């Protein structure tokens, strides 16, 4: 079983080293906290939080970095290498990349103004990467609510609160125009925009993402507080201002009878949201971890030890 005190004897300063790395990076890249939280999410949804996503290509297995959900999207890998090297200096061969990324995700959330808590630790690193599994397990913005629920249940998160709270990760960070083009000009082959997108916001988004424009252009997930981790993401949904299809469906899907009350609850209280976010985050961080003597303590997060 994972425990928050796992490194209190072997590397008590690990959390501080991680925080310092992120604080420093945030000065030149204000998007890094959001990027790191997402890396942890994409790690945990593929064979569990085993740092499998950090592995680079080898002649025997392909990297998850080339998965449809990661390619030209996932970022911050060099920052993880930086904190890993710093931790290896402070405490040689002690902290696993999987745990390091979990702490990095929590510290990123806290630094962005979110809740502060000690994550369970003791995870170990995978001996391989899973590209096919990443392609099958990572959800997509065009997923219907039933599909989003299926995706979460598939990795072990049965609760709608898991889905609604964790989707709160979109309270900050960026999104490429490519992922909302259908919502803006031709949703579900209607030649019309997604009716669940507020018409005033629709005009704003069309200006940021014109037809035939730069699909890689970046837009903020949260129009209220783009870089602050707070419950504004849910207030947006209530006003039909969720950015991507998967965001708005939590409030507008015909299958949202169970998610709507959660959306409202989180929009109404920061405390209720933060509590639910920590609860869901720890549940996600508990997905099929390698523990004890299973796996290894990777020295270089990009490659398996040899
Ligand atoms: C529920 C299904 C989800 C879907 C379909 C989804 C989809 C997306 C998409 C399309 C992007 C934009 C990627 C790009 O433009 O390159 C993105 C970004 C992001 N997502 Fe998710 N996401 C989901 C869940 C989550 C969860 C569970 C978290 C974390 C708890 C999360 C955190 C983030 C963050 C912070 C960003 C911004 C990353 C950055 O700016 O570098 N997402 N997501
Ligand atoms: Ca993984
Ligand atoms: Ca926000
Ligand atoms: O994501």
From Swiss-Prot:
Enzyme class: oxidoreductase
Binding positions (heme b): 170
Keyword annotations: Calcium, Disulfide bond, Glycoprotein, Heme, Hydrogen peroxide, Iron, Metal-binding, Oxidoreductase, Peroxidase, Pyrrolidone carboxylic acid, Secreted, Signal, Vacuole
Residues annotated as binding substrate: 139
Pyrrolidone carboxylic acid modified-residue sites: 1
Pfam families documented for this protein: peroxidase
Main location: secreted
An MF annotation (GO) of this entry: heme binding
UniProt entry tagged with the keyword Calcium: yes
EC number, UniProt record: 1.11.1.7
Protein name: Peroxidase C1A
Organism: Armoracia rusticana
